[PDB]
Design a protein around this ligand. Structure first.
Ligand SMILES: NC(=O)c1ccc[n+]([C@@H]2O[C@H](COP(=O)([O-])OP(=O)(O)OC[C@H]3O[C@@H](n4cnc5c(N)ncnc54)[C@H](O)[C@@H]3O)[C@@H](O)[C@H]2O)c1
Ligand SMILES: NC(=O)c1ccc[n+]([C@@H]2O[C@H](COP(=O)([O-])OP(=O)(O)OC[C@H]3O[C@@H](n4cnc5c(N)ncnc54)[C@H](O)[C@@H]3O)[C@@H](O)[C@H]2O)c1
Lengths: 485, 485
């Protein structure tokens, strides 16, 4: 197959994500023959692990998924290491030598990718030095992969963006959003624009409400430290949920390129309504988990590292509105929570009921197109049909599909995908600045009301599907959740 | 449940259909509590089997599906018999006594149904005498159930209709069409008008071609006598196929009553194009089966009772055209044959491919909604989605549904249904004169070309899906059969 000529620099190349997913993903791209010879990987961090120590380190990350050891060694020989502090301007001149050397060794003409697997605060600095100290490639491309998260509010994200803008244009930036790399999420566009019946039905005339759900049965566990300040609202909503909602609410693009897709999504984001205090209390719900039945399921306030007066939200549910002609009056419901009934990520599109009367006992109900992302991809379609009774009557049936074993084994892990797209230079599966800015602006208005404590904090027995308020939020518009454990 | 007060007269009450399906169906309506007391069944034929002999006869038909024998006896006691020749005008006065007596015995105020399970030629006579000799009920209703077939051409069907019109209005007539009583066929309307996405897509803008298939793996066997003169063209096409095509091509009714449904179907039938000689040769295909591989599968011309110079068609395939705005240019393909690959009755709706380009290797294909009627009800929906590859690419997947065991056991057998609808007076599931007249007119133009031998007779190896000409007929419009064994 075609060879990818690139040189990748991993800032924080000895960390968890690095040796647990980054390195393995890069190995798969080698196994599939995409990376052959003209490529090199330059690890970097503070430790002065020498060139022999690094190789062993990588051999352990790509350990479990290798069988021909000779294949492993030949790959590992494309790695090099250099000790380096990201704040020290001169240290960069040392890195530049490691990079300019690896390039020469494998005749790599430019094409550099800088992966930042470091603390959020260092993002601005590294960007600044890459350009000033001359680590940027004179030929080919220069791309930056920014790890999560991108800011903690609109103000901070704006700062980050402005710093990055000094050296890179927005299209050269690749913010890593885990969920946007999931196979099933990339099917939403295929189903919609690939089948005219849905394509033409994707609007206010045929849909009654769209629902998005991010479920987790696990509690906070040892993640309490950071989680207590972020909560579901920033952990799952602001990033993952909004970017999935983006694929759903987007306009129909003039073409299927990153440029046009982004233009199509931004049209919806720019129509997203921002809430004031009253609206936040009417359209959103925040809750926190109590006890289940089992002592195994302890209340949030009894978890380790959790303050006994914490108002952190472990569950969020709300109604989004898009002031666009195609979405006039169509509610978009989202929900994310911990200690819920099950682990699952899915989209449920509820179509409007038909007005055609059969004179039957049970008249036509609402059809539903469910796209299941996690744990395993599935697509269900609930339709109206005839019941098996003597008198004519309707019922609903579910047509179903599921990913095959062959499909599941060939499915490219999210990181492998994101890394591969970046080498190709395809922002189709990445959130753009415009998208992120609006998402922050939207979430900030909610957080303002929470930090000020101007909304109640609901509670819910662990293992449930959330507080009653979740149901009442939908009941208000004559709606209800399709999924319920 | 509500009780059905009726008195049914079975002309030919000792025949096959009578004791093999008619009687059992009537027993089920008793088991389900619909028929309780104010009802009676008057058998009739030429044999003078006395009132005790008849009861035993019925006890054998409802034999295998009875367990509480006391339930059986109480039912059987509502039957009476009378010897009677249908040509003898005075014999009717004898029948009138059997009927007027049974009515008195169970206080049945009118509501009479006359089932004609006699030879086609007797239909006109019985109708005539029922009215003149006064067997018709003065109160309630008087309905006639006409068994298959209704005419053998337009001329003969017109004769029959005119004779029947002398005593009954068209709405009081109930022509028995086996296939129109099948559960799955009655689902076609539920799926279409019950789900706006299909409802709005049911036209020339979204569908590329509709396909209907009636398959049989069995040969002619001992049915050769009659079959050699009728063939597939009249055996399966004229009746079964056209009436299913009626449900598919129908307009959207102003309501869901028999009157409006029929008005909706007739709009399509009245737009059906009738072919001349050239068109018959371009749009239709007739074939006859040869040998398979196994001696078990003998050529048609070697079957018992088959003339060694017979040009009888054992397979028919053709393109129907509806000159209606909603069907402008949408081909309707039908096919019926013996000794084909499998036994199956199904409808395949092929939607047009999308014009949206993904720049992918495989661009969007045609979606397909398959409704499987026989052997067991199923609904499949082929849609475009994303393939599990590194580069973005589309593929097709099938969402599936199947009838459950509970559904299959509760499914009311076609005859039970037809008989039940007639007692209710619902022509929704029956073909009306207008529908039949056009079907005959359509088929006659084809037969004229066949009897004149102005079209070739194709051949096909038994077990196949038909002659190559079947494929070429669809290839011409850039189409192909969805099902293929
Ligand atoms: N918490 C979340 O929501 C979340 C979830 C998933 C992924 N992530 C990301 O996972 C990544 C975690 O990183 P990790 O697992 O690779 O490891 P890590 O935290 O252990 O440290 C990674 C590297 O940083 C280097 N380092 C530390 N300080 C340095 C400095 N002052 N100068 C130079 N190098 C320095 C260390 O030497 C090490 O090699 C982060 O980028 C985080 O954003 C975040
Ligand atoms: N061939 C097909 O395509 C087809 C398929 C399915 C059903 N059918 C129908 O099945 C039915 C078959 O009838 P059957 O199975 O009940 O039995 P059958 O042919 O044995 O005879 C039925 C009754 O007709 C009576 N009979 C005959 N001549 C009579 C006369 N001159 N006067 C009065 N009574 C007379 C006999 O006594 C008997 O009781 C037919 O109505 C046929 O149309 C046709």
């Amino acid at each position: 197959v075609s060879e990818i000529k690139t040189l990748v620099t991993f800032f924080g190349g000895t960390g968890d994500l690095a040796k647990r997913k980054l390195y393995p993903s890069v190995f798969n791209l080698y196994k599939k023959g995409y990376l052959q010879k003209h490529f090199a990987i330059v690890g970097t961090a503070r430790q002065a692990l020498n060139d022999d120590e690094f190789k062993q380190l990588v051999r352990d990350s790509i350990k479990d998924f290798t069988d021909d050891q000779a294949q492993a060694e030949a790959f590992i020989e494309h790695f090099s290491y250099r000790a380096h502090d990201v704040t020290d301007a001169a240290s960069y001149a040392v890195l530049k030598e490691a990079i300019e050397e690896a390039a020469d060794k494998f005749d790599i003409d430019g094409n550099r990718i800088f992966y930042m697997s470091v603390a959020p605060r260092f993002f601005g600095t590294i960007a600044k030095y890459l350009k000033s100290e001359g680590l940027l490639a004179d030929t080919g491309y220069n791309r930056l992969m920014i790890e999560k998260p991108f800011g903690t509010s609109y103000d901070t994200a704006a700062e980050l963006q402005n710093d990055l803008e000094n050296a890179f244009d927005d299209n050269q930036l690749f913010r890593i959003d885990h969920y946007l790399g999931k196979e099933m999420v990339q099917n939403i566009a295929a189903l919609r624009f690939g089948n005219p019946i849905f394509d033409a039905a994707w609007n206010k005339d045929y849909i009654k409400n769209v629902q998005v759900t991010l479920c987790e049965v696990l509690g906070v566990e040892e993640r309490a430290g950071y989680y207590d300040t972020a909560g579901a609202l920033l952990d799952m909503i602001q990033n993952h949920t909004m970017q999935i909602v983006g694929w759903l609410a987007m306009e129909k693009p003039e073409s299927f390129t990153d440029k046009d897709i982004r233009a199509a999504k931004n049209a919806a984001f720019n129509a997203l309504k921002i809430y004031d205090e009253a609206e936040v209390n009417k359209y959103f719900v925040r809750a926190q988990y109590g006890a289940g039945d089992s002592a195994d399921f302890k209340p949030y306030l009894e978890e380790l590292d959790v303050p006994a007066d914490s108002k952190n939200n472990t569950f969020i549910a709300g109604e989004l509105q898009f002031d666009l002609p195609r979405w006039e009056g169509v509610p978009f419901y989202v929900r994310s929570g911990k200690r819920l009934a099950a682990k699952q990520t899915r989209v449920d599109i509820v179509f409007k009921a038909g007005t055609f009367n059969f004179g039957s006992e049970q008249e036509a109900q609402e059809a539903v197109l469910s796209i299941i992302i996690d744990p395993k991809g599935a697509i269900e379609l609930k339709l109206n049909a005839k019941s098996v009774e003597d008198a004519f009557n309707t019922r609903t049936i579910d047509l179903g599909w599921t990913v095959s074993d062959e499909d599941k084994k060939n499915t490219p892990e999210p990181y492998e995908r994101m890394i591969h797209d970046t080498m190709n230079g395809d922002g189709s599966n990445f959130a753009d600045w415009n998208g992120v800015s609006i998402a922050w602006k939207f979430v900030d208005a909610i957080s303002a009301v929470y930090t000020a404590d101007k909304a109640p904090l609901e509670t819910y027995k662990s293992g449930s599907m959330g507080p009653e308020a979740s149901d009442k939020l939908l009941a208000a518009n004559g709606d209800a959740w399709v999924f319920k454990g």
